[model samples]
Target: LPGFATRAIHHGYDPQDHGGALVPPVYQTATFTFPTVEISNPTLNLLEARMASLEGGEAGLALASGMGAITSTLWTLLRPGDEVLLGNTLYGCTFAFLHHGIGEFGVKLRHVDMADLQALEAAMTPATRVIYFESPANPNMHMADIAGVAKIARKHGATVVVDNTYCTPYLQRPLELGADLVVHSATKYLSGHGDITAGIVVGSQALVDRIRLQGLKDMTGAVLSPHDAALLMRGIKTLNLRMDRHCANAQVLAEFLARQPQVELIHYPGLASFPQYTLARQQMSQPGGMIAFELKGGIGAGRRFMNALQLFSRAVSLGDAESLAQHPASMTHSSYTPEERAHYGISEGLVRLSVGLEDIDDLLADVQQALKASA
Candidate 1:
């Protein structure tokens, strides 16, 4: 197989087959000649194929948004009375969809600390159809044992679905770790920029086909625009390069934060102090670009720190060229109640940072000044 960078640049689309074009051209029409051809947009096909190859899956499907990918996959795989066992912490909207949206239907929802293999095994029942979670979970940087969870799921005859947005395929490939499917908010690392919003699902050909035919066709009808698909492909070509810098910058920032007196705790897999450092090293090539931490002064200090930062943007979404800092308690994880947040270890003071491709010195200085200002 070609190297990850090599495949990122030249996979799925053959130049020889497309009039010798260097890049896949966008098929920018709403409809095709055939009445049933809505499912076969050329640009989307190339992007899907590329993502499938990158994620080590047999097939892939692109959707309008990350939620589209999540909801569609759930709609396709789950039936009435089926249960979904999820990680204790998740992207806020994902948690909302499972707890509020899907629960409105007959589907059962359950949450467990996926890092605990024994607890994961104990949580499974005959009704558990899907084991869904994110490694290095959103806003918390909590790591899950993907292979261990997958093994437990296999024993219980349950499918494992992992959201690979934070690590992308360059950092981690969950399918290779025994996960049945991998989903991504292509808006994040996959796009490598904040320009587009998209989602993707990669898995076995049969499952992907079923999602395309039923979940997308009958349920959400969430389709990716060809122009956006082309943009995502362009972003993907530089994924390896961007991710490397993101990881490096994050490591520096995380280390800097760790040495500060105002920092109460830091959650970054790269740090030796991180509880799941071994698991992260085992499953992921890098610690990823995300860092979560709390300040000594709780939410008040978090607010002051974010307000004092001049370089890092106070934003919500992650995985961009610009560093983003957000307060999880009042921002991404705001949907969860105070009690729930506390129970799940998402402290009110916890702040999430999406480290970007910036000079390490500059990022460090910005953080140093912000910490001082907060103090």
Candidate 2:
């Protein structure tokens, strides 16, 4: 097999097949003729193949958004009476979908701390069809023991789905850790540039085909545009390079925050003080670019710190060239009720940072000044 970087650049397309064009051309039309006519997009197929190869999955399917991937996969695997066991913390939209969207259709929803093997085992039942979670979960940086959870899910005959948006395939491949399927918000690290909003599911060929034929083709109909697919493909070519810088910059920032008196606690896997440092090291090649921490003065100090930032953008989405800082309590995880937020350990004082590929000293300077301003 070629190296990850090589595959990222050359795995999916053969220049010889496209009249010796150096880059794959976008099949910009909306429809394809198949004796009669059916949905087919070559550019989307190329992106899907590249993602599948990168993630070490048998096949892949591209979707319109991260929620599109999540909801479509959930809808495909779950029947009316089936149950979904979700990690205690999730991306706000994912939480909302399981808690409010899917449950409305008579599907059973259960939340468990996947980091606790015993608690996960205690929650499983015959009705559990899908067990879903994000390692280094959104907003909190909570890490789940992926292989352990997969083992438990297997015992109960349940399928395990992991959202690998944060780590992308460069840092972590969930399928390699025994997960049945892996999904990504291609809008993030996969696209690398924050220019496109897309999602992907990669797993066994049969399952991916099921999703493409049913969940995507019939139910959601959330298809990726060829132009956006081309953009995502271009973004992925530099994924390895971007992720390395992202990880390096985040490590410096996390370390800087740790030495500060105003930061009550820091939740970065790279830090030895992180609760799941050991597991994070075992599962991910790097600690990833996302960081979350609590301010000593709670939301008031958190707000002041955000408002004082000059370099880091006060924004929501992550994994861009520009650093982004957001308050999960009122931003990303705002979908969670105030009670739910507290219950799940998302404190009002917490701030989430999507550390970008910026100069380490510049990022450190920005954070240092913001901390002083907050104080």
Candidate 3:
């Protein structure tokens, strides 16, 4: 097999597919014409192909957005009366969708701390058809034991779906650790520049083809524009380089924050202080670019710190070349009940930082000033 970076740039579209152009041009039209067309699978197929290869899966499907990728994949796998075992900590929207949306389909749901193998084992039932989790989970940084969870799910004959948005395929490939499906919010790290919005699902060809045909084509009407696909293709070509810098920046930033007295707690897999550091090292190639921490003085201090940051952009999304930060309690997880948020350990003072590829000293300086202001 070709190396990871080589496959990322070269796997998807052939030069001959686009009249021998060095890069694939945007097809721009809504649907493809028949007769002489070999790109019959939609121009978005190029992005799908690249993503499947990158994630080490057999096939791929690209959708309009991250949530589209998620919802469409679930609709393909599940039916009425099925059950999904979900983690306690998840992206805010994902939490809402599982809690509010899936109920209409008559699907039963169970929430558990995925890191606790005993709890996971006890939670399974005959109705549990799927086991889904996000590793180094969004904002909270609690990592699921990918292989461990996969082992448990397999024994019960349940499908395992992992949200790879936090680590991207650059840092981890959950499929390699026994997941049945790997999902990505390609809008984030996969696009790198933060300009395009897209999502992808990769797995066995049977499942991906099913999603492409039914979940996307017939039901969701989710389609990735050729222009956005082209942009995503460009972003993926440099994914490895960008990810390297992102991981490096996050490692240093997490350490810097750990030393600040105002930071009540720091959550980054790279830090030795993290409770699940050993498990993180076992599954992930690198500790990813996302970090979550809280200030000692509570929400009041968090507001001051956010306002004082001069270099970081205040944003909800992650995986851009530019550093971004957000208040998870108020901004992202506001939809969750106070009790639920507390159970997930999402404190009012918590800040989720998407570390970027920037000069280390400047990033450190901004964080230093912000902490002082908050303190």
Candidate 4:
């Protein structure tokens, strides 16, 4: 029997190459040394096995970054004029990519408020080719019901794609809940460090192979470097432990914020106040890490809260070992017009908190001081 930590550490490995290195060595090369693609068969076979063992995905194609994984997956499967239905709440880059970027290529993109399952069902037109969403959504920390979303996709004859980055495989396994595709931003929590960037996808064997061969292999090239992939694989080893600390800290901070009158509201799945709390309880093993809240001071208060933070560092990316706080409305998701941001329920007062493996008391004090400053 192996622990979850051990499984993560050895996710993509085999005995022969383990080499007693404790950790696998990074294989950094643009091209592999082989007579042909056919000759490099065994190495590729090993990669496939890892994908199966880890994600239950038929095949896996690592990418340079989370966005690289996104582009590769979309390009491989969805054609121009095809439709993809995405939630209103997504990372700013991902939101922009679907709404404006893919539209340039004639891929029709529709934005739906995923909070409403009825709306999702109503919006699934015959033209809808893909059902896409994120749970414990970026910045906002709002959760969508995976089983419900997957059911909608299946009924509509559309393929379901869930961005499982926030939950990772440790907390919520989306595929088991009926999602056809599970995507990840391994750069964040999976690596557990801010040092590397990588993306991954897991799904049925046949679908993954079709996407890899037809989509990633030839058309849009955003493949991961072997070194980066291995780095990501290495980082995953500590995922279970790191997540334990991250979530515990986040809970402390979230509860703290909820008690503050200066804090307008806290948006974390673990809290009973979350709109989707019932669904969250059914689907998630734990709330995991991450929290979002709106300060009473509104946008200005949000800014002051961020500026006043003495202990929590201000940073752009998330899921690191250090506590980070940011104003999403004016920072990461700022690209959106005020109206667009509002549609996603990301307001000027909203601050996204990426709680890390710090002492709860220290993290709470930091939030206390930040709130006092805002006040």
Candidate 5:
């Protein structure tokens, strides 16, 4: 097999396949002309196949959105009475989907700090059908022990699905860590740009096919458009290069912020001070482009620092060419109750930083001035 960088750019695509056009053409038609059981779209399939190759999976399915992938995957195996155990920390929208949307479908949702092995053990029951989590999870930066949890889930016959949206395949491949399925918000890192809203599931062909037949093609009808697929593929071609600079800049910022007086705590797996630094070293190549930290002056301090930034844009999405920042407690995690947020370790002053591929000196200068202004 070709290496990661080569495979990401070449898999599922060939210059000859696109009539020497360098890039694949978009098939914008809604449905195929011929009557076939499969929803065979060339561009979409190419994107899915490329993703599967990167993650080392048997097959892949592209969906309309990240939640589309999540909902469709859940419907595949979850019955009315089946239960799912989730790590307490997850992306804001994902947390709401499992707690409210999916729960409404008659599935039971159980929240546990995945780091607590005993709690994870106690949470799993005969009815437990799924174990879902995010590593370096969301704004909280919780790093789940992927192999540890996968071993437990396999013994109990539970399906293990991991959100690889944060690390992308370049940094971590959960399938290699024994996860049954790996999911991605292609809008973030995989796409490596802020343009497209897409999702993918990589797993055994049988499991993904079930999700496609039972959930995606039927109930959800969520399909990735050809144009978006082309855009995502373009974005992915540069993922390795972007991630290198992103990681380097983030490491600089994390180290800088840790020594600042206005910062309360810094969360970046690159730092040895992180709770799961050892696990992170084992799980991912670089610590990634994202960072979360608390400001000393609480939400006010966070607001000031974000407002004072010149280079970093105030935004929500991560893995962009430009740096972005957001307040998770008031922005991403606002939907969760104050108690729930606290339980998940999302403090009021928490700020999420999507460090971008910028010059380290420029990024450091922005942070220095922002902290001074906030103080």
Candidate 6:
């Protein structure tokens, strides 16, 4: 958007054939007759084109869910026993996926902190097939230098993928920044509203085509309900605008939370105090609202904290209009061992926050009360 308003007004809307509707229409029907409004894949194809345009990719494919996009990508690019160098710091759900059964497909996951370039560089073996990461990583906002990792992976002939869900196209464009591929768990920020579940992968035309043929055609079966596609299209229209507020509110709350002693720590890259604050500014346009931090007490305190919250919802799945809080160590990262959790800085006291558009005062007050209860 030249200015935020202009982008919110026109970014994802296709005025050409959308019948000039102020918002995109939801196509609820699975089958659309073409010749007879013949049911073909064209409807989905249209969504893919729009998805690509929004995310800055030459081509695109809409998957059933984010996991579909991920596994499909992994399945297509890797052979059995192939190695993927992943950030020990990753979306907790994704970390579990890689650590567990992707191995059953012959892939061995090598976990390394993306923040540690030396370790990442050393971990690259001939079997290493891909280097994957999420910057300002979820539940705990660890910044990853995409360009640096891309350099190492490319030099070693491994593909690089960044799960840019937390920092969507509005904040960071990995492709433009030198990464090979970009994927999003569209259920998050891309949809803006939490009404739909979708996953999108964007990249070179040839790569997208190959993925569509193999991943979309064969392995990936979760067809985004055309209705959800339409909802997402509507959602993307306001992505740039929504992101502006998300960043604004998150920055305010993160700073405020840092001053509260009941809160052990505040994890947000937007804060200049972050360990990789400089890198985050260089790599991402801004750190959108995803934070992982700790309370004074461990898991027990965090659980009480969740129960005492009034306004903010305690739940999983974020990137919505509403604020969400969760305990990664027990909820999302429970699969990781105590030792493994420690390695990634996911402490028992840590709670992940996806700050929303709520008035900053209400947000902070809710947190303050919750912290007191937890304390």
Report each candidate's C-alpha RMSD, comma-separated, in the order given.
2.1, 1.8, 2.1, 2.7, 2.1, 3.0
For candidate 2, list the clashing residue pairs, or say none.
none
**Per-residue error at 362 for model 5, in Å?**
1.8
If the candidates were sorted by their lDDT against the true structure, best first, what order would they fall in? 1, 2, 5, 3, 6, 4
What lDDT score belongs to each candidate, Candidate 1 first? 0.91, 0.90, 0.86, 0.76, 0.87, 0.79
Off by over 4 Å in 2: 34-39, 330-340
TM-score of 3: 0.95
Between which residue pairs do clashes occur in model 1?
Answer: none
Reference-based TM-score, model 4: 0.90
Question: Which residue pairs come into collision in candidate 6?
Answer: 33-37, 33-38, 34-37, 34-38, 64-222, 80-106, 81-106, 81-107
Model 1 poorest ten-residue lDDT run: 31-40
TM-score of each: 0.96, 0.96, 0.95, 0.90, 0.95, 0.89
In model 6, the Cα lDDT at residue 361 comes to 88
**Per-residue lDDT of candidate 1, residues 1-375 (tens digit):** 999888888887689998999876789999867566453888898899889999999999999999999999999999889999999888878988988888789999998999999999988899999999998887567889999998889889999999999999999999999999999999999998899999999999998999999999899999999899899999999999999999999998999899999999999999999988898999999999999999998877888898999999999989999999998677665788879878867787899899999888889999999999877
Give per-residue CA lDDT, model 4, range 109-173, as digits (tens): 88787768899998888888888888877756667777887888888898888888888778888
List ranges where model 6 is wrong by over 4 Å.
1-40, 329-344
lDDT of 5 by residue, 219-268 (tens): 78888888888899899899999999899889988998899999899899
State, as a TM-score between 0 and 1, how close model 5 is to the true structure.
Answer: 0.95
Candidate 2: residue 153 lDDT (0-100): 89
Cα lDDT, model 3, residue 339: 75
Please give the lDDT score at residue 220 for candidate 5. 83
